[PDB]
Design an enzyme around this catalytic site. Structure first.
Site, PDB file in Angstrom:
ATOM      1  N   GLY A  46     -12.049 -14.029  17.538  1.00  0.00           N
ATOM      2  CA  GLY A  46     -11.044 -13.241  16.516  1.00  0.00           C
ATOM      3  C   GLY A  46      -9.786 -13.768  16.402  1.00  0.00           C
ATOM      4  N   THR A  47      -8.746 -13.338  15.506  1.00  0.00           N
ATOM      5  CA  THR A  47      -7.616 -13.854  15.384  1.00  0.00           C
ATOM      6  C   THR A  47      -6.697 -14.195  16.424  1.00  0.00           C
ATOM      7  OG1 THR A  47      -6.444 -11.899  14.532  1.00  0.00           O
ATOM      8  CG2 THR A  47      -7.807 -13.005  12.909  1.00  0.00           C
ATOM      9  N   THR A  48      -5.783 -14.968  16.363  1.00  0.00           N
ATOM     10  CA  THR A  48      -4.632 -15.260  17.516  1.00  0.00           C
ATOM     11  C   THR A  48      -3.682 -14.024  17.348  1.00  0.00           C
ATOM     12  OG1 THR A  48      -5.088 -17.756  16.900  1.00  0.00           O
ATOM     13  CG2 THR A  48      -3.569 -17.000  18.407  1.00  0.00           C
TER      14      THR A  48
ATOM     15  N   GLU B 153      -1.754 -12.778  14.174  1.00  0.00           N
ATOM     16  CA  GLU B 153      -2.121 -13.409  13.096  1.00  0.00           C
ATOM     17  C   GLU B 153      -3.108 -12.493  12.303  1.00  0.00           C
ATOM     18  OE1 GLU B 153      -4.865 -17.395  11.859  1.00  0.00           O
ATOM     19  OE2 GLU B 153      -5.253 -16.427  13.782  1.00  0.00           O
TER      20      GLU B 153
ATOM     21  N   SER C  61      -7.383  -9.263  20.328  1.00  0.00           N
ATOM     22  CA  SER C  61      -8.452  -9.927  19.453  1.00  0.00           C
ATOM     23  C   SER C  61      -9.561  -9.645  19.624  1.00  0.00           C
ATOM     24  CB  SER C  61      -7.719 -11.659  19.865  1.00  0.00           C
ATOM     25  OG  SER C  61      -6.341 -11.812  19.565  1.00  0.00           O
TER      26      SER C  61
END
Ligand SMILES: [Mg+2]
Lengths: 231, 250, 241, 195, 240, 243, 235, 244, 111
Positions: F29-31, F46, F74
């Site tokens: 997943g995204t940060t 993010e 995330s």
């Protein structure tokens, strides 16, 4: 492989294969396009027939006077999810005298789909949905995936060959977002978008399905000779 | 959630064996030896207190348990399984008997209730059999003194004397040579201590041996006086000192 | 080979899922120790905060179950907190139903019975934890009762749990062989804590700062944990003789 | 409904039941048959609250017919009467009890004996030489106490029954529109079509 | 509760549990039904592997569902009792609510419905039973004979057989039964039914059961000697 | 083998492999990050811009619980939404019975026990998210991070997702260089920088920054989204630091 | 084993796809919609000559204005018919009117995907639902175990379906009379049937606005078969 | 999830057999032999205990012969614990019938009820069947003396003479050879003991390895008596019939 | 004791012409001797060229009209936007009312 027998199993790389297979059913489905301006939101859908004796499968479902969607994938699953949306729109109006916000409708669809991805015995939904609506913050377009992921967009397309329409909308972004107070031109842009996904076949009078909702426009579906004007 | 294991985990194999019951009996075979001997005027049950650590206080772990004032139990196999069975046996003696007839159940019927519980863990959905064999000693007015063995399958048998667990085969042969129908309780205790010594490796004293009897009524252990018909429990656990006294006359 | 996945018997009469739960018990790489005084029961446990981004005040494996009962856990924190919440609920319910504080040994039995159920019922997994309950019981005095994933429990004069339990156990055994009594013959709990820390230092062969330890003390009518500065005072006294 | 009588003679049981059905102000019918055949040699007459009477009787009939088919065997009058008693004893502690009183007349083919059972809505059962429900017994029992003999013929039983009905027609305030009379013996159940 | 889907489709579109239930029927003792002009006869095979049997008390193969309808079967004996009990309860329920006994077709439709239900309900297996249901509709003199099977399909038959070696006795019936002229009497119908079983049975002794159902609830089971007289007359005509 | 095919099964190591596979979804997943400041907490995430057709600022990821708790996660976004829905029920029932808003440590255990419960049975799948959450209560600011196993601890700073290693290193510098503490406004600026720096692991597509905060002095202990001028100021500060 | 509600890698439900194979083994059923009515015809396919063929019921009335033909595991159709009849009657009770043919079809198709671990498996039968209502005139629908239903001008299901559908492709036009449709169903059934078509192994039915749903007598169908034979010999 | 570990106890084999029923019958074939013989003046039940010990308390022991009511008894072959579950259910059914109709339950009705319970475990519930075969000996005033057997499938049949458990093939052939319809109880007692003596896997047939029972109208006038033989009484009848 | 019913007064009148229909009602809402409102609409356009009024206890009246309006909405959803005819609406209202046979809507309805 050994991890695709049910929705309750992660793969060693953290994937959920039953959900990914459900996503694959959408890709086999017929193409449908969604796009909006600041005054209106439009759905365009290519309907699919079984053969020349058969009817063309309907793709667009009305959920309320201000909201509705188009489907790609398992049609009975779209009926279940659209019925749920009808009930939630209805609950909001009856209890709170309030039209259900399109963003909140997306959140409700996400949570309903999620429960079928974390429990034993069930299965994910096998359909993708494009929800358009006009509420207190203007026009809206949503894309629903049966993974649970719901996304708000200016325009998009789902189904087979949807990538052609999606690239066209990505080019035209600055033009069609400005088509305010002109329903016919916004539909034209949508009909031109869905044309970038056709091969061998073209848009006929029983092939094309169009829906529109806007500032002073209840959600209405156009089929038959009502779309000949746009062919 | 919800228990979604509503199907049997014990089933018949092609040869007619119930695998899980056989494997439960194997767990009992690995267990520490326990025995029971019936005399004319009493019954004795005994086992070794196999302490897991010398820092552990083995007096806080009871292998021989009172079920009713006149009925006691010992086991071989899985300790935790035994502990919960003792809880269930104590309760069922009340719910399915004492709260109905105003008296404690006869030995054979309490044994029957414990057996039923063990049978159900062999057929009910989503459970394994209990990994213990029980020896239940008791007295009641119309049946006198009795001793029963209950196995993981739920089957039970009455014995004059028997042994279960680790060294049961050798212990049963030892008991066959010594048992007669004229034994007094003290003779049975003596034979029990002799038999148990063979299966014990290390220390053999009142602190490493657990022994209880079903014998005479103990009015001194009743806790109250004034009712002539109430004369006290027949179950009595022997003290560490009482065991050691009989180990000098050994 | 599905007899290894759920809690049913193997052909040898073994429960592998129970055995593997015992192995999960040492996943935190933490050792704990418990001893009894005249008036108190002391439990100490190693504290390791490997990340600088962590708030060290929230890293704990000692739990205040009731006013009188404390519990140290050996095993992963999710299962530890699961057991902690249940033990707290059981202790509170007991007091409501029976009108007196739940004894340490009775709570241990209750949690052991719950653990036994997980070894017999297939749909429930064992918790990968060992639970050491401590108190000064109003009837039995200073008490240590320890529960494991098999549903086994027993009382202890003293006990140790963790990857290096054997070293600590043998060290404690040797001391009680000398003294020939079942407890630390000391008036104050401060000195019983000092005994506990000293003998852990001896057994593990490692020195401790104030942030390397975690201490719980049970006295009559209350269990409490020591602050870093309380532990520092304890460490200073150990070094000064 | 109203009057139901029963008499057990030497070789048969005779049940007499009134024909009137009254809806408060008007007599809606004067030919009502307040009886059900439970088995070839067992008859049940009934009286009580409207609706519940026929509902209970047909429910019992269905159950006895089911037993007969399952076992290819006719239950004894005693066994049938015990089944009926239990149903009423269960009913009296229900949310809404069956307000139904019955007489069961049967010929036991095994013992070669007629049998008459009287059961009220509470589940109170008694075996009798003669019986009734409601106020019927108040008018007829003094006549039956006098004339009854255990060795009476069927014809003598019918004659004693006529005297009972005549006394009812004289002293009762209600017009019950006569009675339907049925005989239960070794040959089964038959209706006396002139009474 | 136990919810496992035991009856499911296979890649070739077959439900194997239903098909294996038919294999249990194939193993069962042979049953045959023949309708005449004014009667229906049900014949049943008794395997003589079991002697020292008490024939007075042993469950008989033909069962009355009501006074006017009978049911015979091939397959699992224990399974058939459940279907027989349900049918008997439904027959009394129909009399109670409609005030008319069941038609033979209605009773067949009900039993077949129960069998179908057990092919798409969770946690249950199909019945290993096929049935022959025969009788006369109330106030009707036209003979009725129906067949059901584990899948739940049912149909009417002029003559039919089920169970082991039923392929052989159906062969016999297909060449010996004329539709334009069915067995005009009870005698002729019983004779044709005994003849059909003699193709398969072995000894004509206590191996053949015969039940005759006539209009207006007239049902009777023939005895050993009565059947033995048919067995005798058939072979004496065969010696030619 | 086969120990990894079913949830709640112990391997011979004493490991739950299905929980370890859920962590892989989180790492994909995204940060997302969390910073604990002097009188509150800051959350940042993010958001990958997959296409130009995504409406800017509309697909909001950070979620509020009650009025004083913020949550970011995330991994599988739907799983995170399911966890927040449960958290909202837990917070509502706590406030219903006890009147006071749920304390952050109390709220942490409610999420923890619920996530842990999804490692007890094979009839359910573990959560495919790591959740960073916190806020202000009567005892001050609290920041927590919760993993698929149900494990959670208190943090000075926290990070998860694809760029977690980069983010963690940045957070560790802030802890060392500010033992006295960080102001809420400083923490918003620093959060913007860290997400921009962590975006190197996701450099293919451009992204949208989303920040929220709860501060005793700046937001009255209520959870609020950073918008307009304050957001632009943080974006400028971040862009200046990467150049 | 594997879930009953499992998706394949292609995004199809295994059990639904397998039930479609069972329907391919079923006896043929054909429907043709005209402006004068809709015709429904079936192959009876008796397994033995001793089986009384008029007890084979593969064409069924749902209401006066709606009929239905089946192909596949026909025992599975009974609860579907029961539901359809109940839905038709219930709507008339609630609304004092006839239910729309599409609405009835949708109600039947709602049952289809109600299987899992509700019923244990999908239905193994396909339905041709024919009828008339005031809003959309004469209609023919094809209801599948997938829950999907298509409207058709003409449709064939069962073992002879793809050969029959190709034939229907050529023969159907928007001006067909009822009589022309009857002969057309008979002609195509005769083409795909194993045994020789007569009034005992095939069955006809129709739905008209005036007379409603009617199953044809064997004598009536026998005449239409004779009329078919003569017109095919006429060139 | 849980489906992985399900044995599916209630499915057909490709041949149309019930796996678990067949395997339960295999289990029963290793149990001690039980024999029932019906005569004109009563019924005999004889059964062999499984390899016993000298320390087993025989006079208080029961593993084979059980009383259901005053008129009906059963001989057990298979899992004793499974049998006791069913026996208690049967005892309750008999009392339910007596309470409802005020008459003793006819033998076949009790047998059908227990057999239906066995059948249920083969068709639904996903549980293992009961590993038990029964011989029912009983009397009622409709059919008189009756013998039945039931097995794990829930199927039941009536018999003049029958065996269950070990060596039933050998036992049934011996019974078929010497049984006659006009036989009396005392003759049937001898036949039962002679058959067990020949079919036993033990070296010799002694009193401590047997359980014995008779149902006789040898009860003073038109009534029936059940007699569960004592160890000494089994020893005497062994001497009387000349086996020891 | 709690009384779940009240009386809000009001009078309504429906007349059917040859090719038209009128539904009229006063706008006064009351309890006992007090006026709650001088203008509280009581006759409602329910869509599909149907007008409705449920006079009596206003809470039950508002509830019934609200549920019928909802029934019109779902009739369109379920039956391809078919117009709900007046006879069909009437039968539908019977079922709405009889659904509470043992705890009735205390109103007199006219459409
Ligand atoms: Mg377990």
């Amino acid at each position: 492989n050994n991890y695709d027998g049910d929705t309750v199993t992660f793969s060693p790389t953290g994937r959920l294969f039953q959900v990914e297979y459900a996503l694959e059913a959408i890709k086999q489905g017929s193409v449908t396009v969604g796009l909006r301006s600041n005054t209106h939101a439009v759905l365009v859908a290519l309907k699919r027939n079984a053969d020349e004796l058969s009817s063309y499968q309907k793709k667009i479902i009305k959920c309320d006077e201000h909201m509705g969607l188009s489907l790609a994938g398992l049609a009975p699953d779209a009926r279940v999810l659209s019925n749920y949306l009808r009930q939630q729109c209805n609950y909001s109006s009856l209890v709170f005298n309030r039209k259900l916000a399109v963003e909140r409708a997306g959140h409700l669809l996400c949570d309903k789909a999620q429960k079928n991805t974390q429990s034993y015995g069930g299965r994910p939904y096998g359909v993708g949905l494009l929800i358009i609506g006009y509420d207190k913050s203007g026009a809206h377009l949503l894309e629903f995936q049966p993974s649970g992921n719901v996304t708000e967009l200016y325009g998009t397309a789902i189904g087979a060959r949807s990538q052609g329409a999606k690239t066209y909308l990505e080019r035209t972004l600055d033009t069609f977002i400005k088509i305010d107070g002109n329903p016919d031109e916004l539909i034209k842009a949508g009909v031109e978008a869905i044309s970038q996904s056709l091969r061998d076949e073209s848009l006929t009078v029983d092939n094309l399905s169009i829906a529109i909702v806007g500032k002073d426009t209840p959600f209405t579906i156009y089929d038959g000779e009502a779309v000949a004007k746009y062919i | 959630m919800t228990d979604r294991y509503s199907f049997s985990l014990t089933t018949f194999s092609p040869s007619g064996k119930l695998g899980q019951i056989d494997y439960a009996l194997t767990a009992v075979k690995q267990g520490v030896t326990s025995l029971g001997i019936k005399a004319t005027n009493g019954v004795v049950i005994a086992t070794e207190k196999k302490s897991s650590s010398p820092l552990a206080m083995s007096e806080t772990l009871s292998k021989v348990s009172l079920l009713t004032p006149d009925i006691g139990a010992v086991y071989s196999g899985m300790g935790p399984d035994y502990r919960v069975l003792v809880d269930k046996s104590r309760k069922v003696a009340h719910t399915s008997y004492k709260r109905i007839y105003g008296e404690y159940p006869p030995t054979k019927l309490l044994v029957s209730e414990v057996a039923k519980i063990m049978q159900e863990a062999t057929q009910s959905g989503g459970v394994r059999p209990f990994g213990v064999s029980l020896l239940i000693a008791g007295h009641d007015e119309f049946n006198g003194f009795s001793l029963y063995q209950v196995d993981p399958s739920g089957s039970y048998f009455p014995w004059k004397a028997t042994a279960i667990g680790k060294g049961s085969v050798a212990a049963k042969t030892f008991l066959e040579k010594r048992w007669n129908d004229e034994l007094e309780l003290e003779d049975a205790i003596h034979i029990a201590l002799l038999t148990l010594k063979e299966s014990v490796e290390g220390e053999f004293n009142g602190d490493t041996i657990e022994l209880a009897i079903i014998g005479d009524e103990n009015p001194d252990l009743l806790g109250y006086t004034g009712i002539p018909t109430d004369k006290g429990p027949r179950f009595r656990k022997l003290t560490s000192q009482e065991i050691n006294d009989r180990l000098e006359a050994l | 080979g599905y007899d290894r996945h759920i809690t049913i018997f193997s052909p040898e009469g073994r429960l592998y899922q129970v055995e593997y739960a015992f192995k999960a018990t040492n996943q935190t790489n933490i050792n704990s120790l418990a001893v009894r005084g005249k008036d108190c029961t002391v439990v100490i446990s190693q504290k390791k905060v490997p990340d600088k981004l962590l708030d060290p005040t929230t890293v704990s494996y000692i739990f205040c179950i009731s006013r009188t009962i404390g519990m140290v856990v050996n095993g992963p924190i999710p299962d530890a907190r699961n057991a902690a919440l249940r033990a707290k609920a059981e202790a509170a319910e007991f007091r409501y139903k029976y009108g007196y504080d739940m004894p340490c040994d009775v709570l241990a039995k209750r949690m052991a019975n719950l653990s036994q159920i997980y070894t017999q019922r297939a749909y429930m997994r064992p918790l990968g934890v060992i639970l050491t309950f401590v108190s000064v019981d109003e009837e039995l005095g200073p008490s240590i009762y320890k529960t494991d994933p098999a549903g086994y429990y027993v009382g202890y004069k003293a006990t140790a749990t963790g990857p290096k339990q054997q070293e600590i156990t043998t060290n404690l055994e040797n001391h009680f062989k000398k003294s020939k009594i079942d407890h630390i013959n000391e008036e104050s709990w401060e000195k019983v804590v000092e005994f506990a820390i000293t003998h852990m230092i001896d057994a593990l062969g490692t020195e401790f700062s104030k942030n390397d330890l975690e201490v719980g003390v049970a006295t009559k009518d209350k269990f409490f944990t020591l602050s870093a500065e309380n532990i520092e005072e304890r460490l200073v006294a150990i070094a000064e003789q | 409904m109203d009057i139901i009588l029963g008499i057990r003679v030497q070789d048969s049981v005779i049940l007499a039941s009134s024909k009137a059905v009254t809806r408060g102000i008007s007599v809606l019918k004067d030919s009502d048959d307040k009886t059900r055949q439970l088995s070839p040699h067992t008859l049940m007459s009934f009286a009580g609250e409207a609706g519940d009477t026929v509902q209970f009787a047909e429910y019992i009939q269905a159950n006895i017919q089911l037993y007969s088919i399952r076992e290819d065997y006719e239950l004894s009058p005693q066994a049938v009467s015990s089944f009926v008693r239990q149903e009423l004893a269960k009913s009296i502690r229900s949310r809404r009890p069956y307000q139904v009183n019955v007489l069961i007349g049967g010929y036991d083919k095994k013992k070669n004996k007629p049998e008459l059972y009287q059961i009220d809505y509470l589940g109170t059962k008694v075996e009798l030489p003669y019986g009734a429900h409601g106020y019927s017994g108040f008018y007829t029992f003094s006549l039956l106490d006098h004339h009854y003999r255990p060795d009476m013929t069927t014809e003598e039983g019918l004659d004693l029954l006529k005297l009972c009905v005549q006394e009812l027609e004289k002293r009762m305030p209600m017009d019950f529109k006569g009675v339907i009379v049925k005989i239960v013996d070794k040959d089964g159940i038959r209706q006396v079509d002139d009474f | 509760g136990y919810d496992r889907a035991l009856s499911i489709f296979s890649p070739d579109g077959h439900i194997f549990q239903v098909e294996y239930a038919l294999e249990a029927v194939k193993r069962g003792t042979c049953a045959v039904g023949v309708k005449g002009k004014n009667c229906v006869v049900l014949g049943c095979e008794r395997r003589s592997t079991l002697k020292l049997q008490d024939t007075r008390i042993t469950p008989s193969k033909v069962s009355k569902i009501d006074s006017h309808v009978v049911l015979s079967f091939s397959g699992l004996n224990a399974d058939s009792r459940i279907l027989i009990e349900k049918a008997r309860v439904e027959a009394q329920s129909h009399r109670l609510t409609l005030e008319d006994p069941v038609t033979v077709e209605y009773l067949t439709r009900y039993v077949a419905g129960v069998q179908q239900r057990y092919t798409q309900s969770g946690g249950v297996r199909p019945f290993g039973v096929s049935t022959l249901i025969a009788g006369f509709d109330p106030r009707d003199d036209e003979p009725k004979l129906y067949q059901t099977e584990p899948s739940g399909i049912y149909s009417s038959w002029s003559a039919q057989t089920i169970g082991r070696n039923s392929k052989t006795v159906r062969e016999f019936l297909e060449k010996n039964y004329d539709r334009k002229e069915p067995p005009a009497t009870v005698e002729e119908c019983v004779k044709l039914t005994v003849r059909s079983l003699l193709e398969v049975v072995q000894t004509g002794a206590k191996n053949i059961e015969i039940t005759v159902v006539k209009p207006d609830s007239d049902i009777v089971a023939l005895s050993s000697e009565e059947i033995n007289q048919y067995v005798t007359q058939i072979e004496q005509e065969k010696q030619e | 083998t086969g120990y990894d095919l079913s949830n709640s099964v112990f391997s011979p190591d004493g490991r739950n492999f299905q929980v370890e596979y859920a962590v892989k979804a989180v790492e994909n997943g995204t940060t997302s990050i969390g910073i604990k400041c002097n009188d509150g907490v800051v959350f940042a995430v993010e958001k990958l811009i997959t296409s130009k057709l995504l409406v800017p600022q509309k697909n909001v990821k950070i979620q509020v619980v009650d009025r004083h708790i913020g949550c970011v996660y995330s991994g599988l976004i739907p799983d995170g939404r399911h966890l927040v829905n449960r958290g909202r029920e837990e917070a509502a029932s706590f406030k219903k019975l006890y009147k006071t808003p749920i304390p952050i440590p109390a709220f942490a255990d409610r999420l923890g026990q619920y996530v842990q419960a999804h490692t007890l049975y094979n009839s359910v799948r573990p959560f495919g998210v790591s959740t960073i959450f916190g806020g202000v209560d009567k005892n001050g600011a609290h920041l927590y991070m919760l993993e698929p196993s149900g494990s959670y601890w208190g943090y000075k700073g926290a990070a998860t997702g694809k760029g977690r290693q980069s983010a963690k290193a940045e957070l560790e510098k802030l802890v060392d260089h500010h033992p006295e503490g960080l102001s809420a406004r400083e923490a918003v600026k620093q959060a913007a920088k860290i997400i921009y720096l962590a975006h190197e692991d996701n450099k293919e597509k451009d992204f949208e920054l989303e920040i929220s905060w709860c501060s005793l002095s700046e937001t009255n202990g209520l959870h609020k989204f950073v918008k307009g001028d304050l957001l632009q100021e943080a974006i400028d500060f971040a862009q200046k630091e990467i150049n | 084993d594997r879930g009953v509600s499992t998706f394949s890698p292609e995004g199809r439900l295994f059990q639904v796809e397998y039930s479609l194979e069972a329907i391919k083994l079923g006896s043929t059923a054909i429907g043709i919609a005209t402006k004068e009515g809709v015709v429904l015809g079936v192959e009876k396919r008796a397994t033995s000559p001793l089986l009384e063929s008029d007890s084979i019921e593969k064409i069924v009335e749902i209401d006066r204005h709606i009929g239905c033909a089946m192909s596949g595991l026909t025992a599975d159709a009974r609860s579907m018919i029961e539901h359809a009849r109940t839905a038709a009657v219930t709507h008339n009770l609630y609304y004092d009117e006839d239910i729309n043919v599409e609405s009835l079809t949708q109600s039947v198709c709602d049952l289809a995907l109600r299987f899992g671990e509700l019923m244990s498996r999908p239905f193994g039968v396909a339905l041709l639902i024919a009828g008339h209502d005031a809003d959309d005139g004469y209609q023919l629908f094809h209801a599948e175990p997938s829950g999907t239903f298509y409207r058709y001008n003409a449709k064939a299901i069962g073992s002879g379906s793809e050969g029959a559908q190709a034939e229907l492709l050529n023969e159907w036009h928007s001006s067909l009379t009822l009589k022309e449709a009857e002969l057309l169903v008979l002609k195509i059934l005769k083409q795909v049937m194993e045994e020789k078509l007569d009034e005992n192994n095939a069955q006809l039915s129709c739905i008209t606005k005036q007379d409603g749903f009617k199953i044809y007598d064997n004598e009536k169908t026998a005449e239409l078969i004779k009329e078919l034979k003569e017109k095919e010999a006429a060139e | 999830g849980s489906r992985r570990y399900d044995s599916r106890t209630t499915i057909f084999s490709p041949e149309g057999r019930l796996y678990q029923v067949e395997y339960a019958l295999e289990s029963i074939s290793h149990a001690g032999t039980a024999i029932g013989i019906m005569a004109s003046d009563g019924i005999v039940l004889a059964a062999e205990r499984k390899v016993t010990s000298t320390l087993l308390e025989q006079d208080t022991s029961t593993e084979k012969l059980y009383k259901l009511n005053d008129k009906i008894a059963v001989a057990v072959a298979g899992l004793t614990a499974d049998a006791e579950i069913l026996i208690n259910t049967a005892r309750i059914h008999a009392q339910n019938y007596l309470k409802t109709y005020n008459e003793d339950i006819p033998v076949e009705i009790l047998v059908r009820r227990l057999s239906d319970i066995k059948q249920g475990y083969t068709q639904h519930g996903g549980l293992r069947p009961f590993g038990v075969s029964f011989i029912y000996a009983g009397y009622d005033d409709r059919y008189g003396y009756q013998l039945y057997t039931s097995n794990p499938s829930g199927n039941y049949t009536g018999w003049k003479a029958i065996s269950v458990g070990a060596n039933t093939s050998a036992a049934q052939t011996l019974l078929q050879m010497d049984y006659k319809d006009d036989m009396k109880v005392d003759d049937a007692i001898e036949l039962a003991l002679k058959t067990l003596s020949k079919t036993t896997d033990s070296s010799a047939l002694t009193y401590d390895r047997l359980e014995f029972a008779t149902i006789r109208k040898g009860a003073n006038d038109g009534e029936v008596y059940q007699k569960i033989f004592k160890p000494q009484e089994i020893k005497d009848i062994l001497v009387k019939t000349g086996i020891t | 004791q709690f009384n779940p019913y009240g009386d809000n007064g009001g009078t309504i009148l429906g007349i059917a012409g040859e090719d038209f229909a009128v539904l009229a009602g006063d706008t006064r809402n009351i309890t006992d001797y007090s006026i709650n409102s001088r203008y509280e609409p009581k006759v409602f356009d329910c869509g599909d060229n149907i007008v409705m009024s449920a006079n009596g206890f206003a809470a039950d009246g508002d509830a019934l009209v609200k549920r019928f309006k909802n029934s019109v909405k779902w009739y369109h959803f379920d039956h391809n936007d078919k117009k709900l005819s007046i006879n069909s609406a009437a039968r539908n209202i019977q079922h709405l009312l009889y659904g509470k046979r043992f705890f009735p809507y205390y109103v007199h309805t006219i459409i």
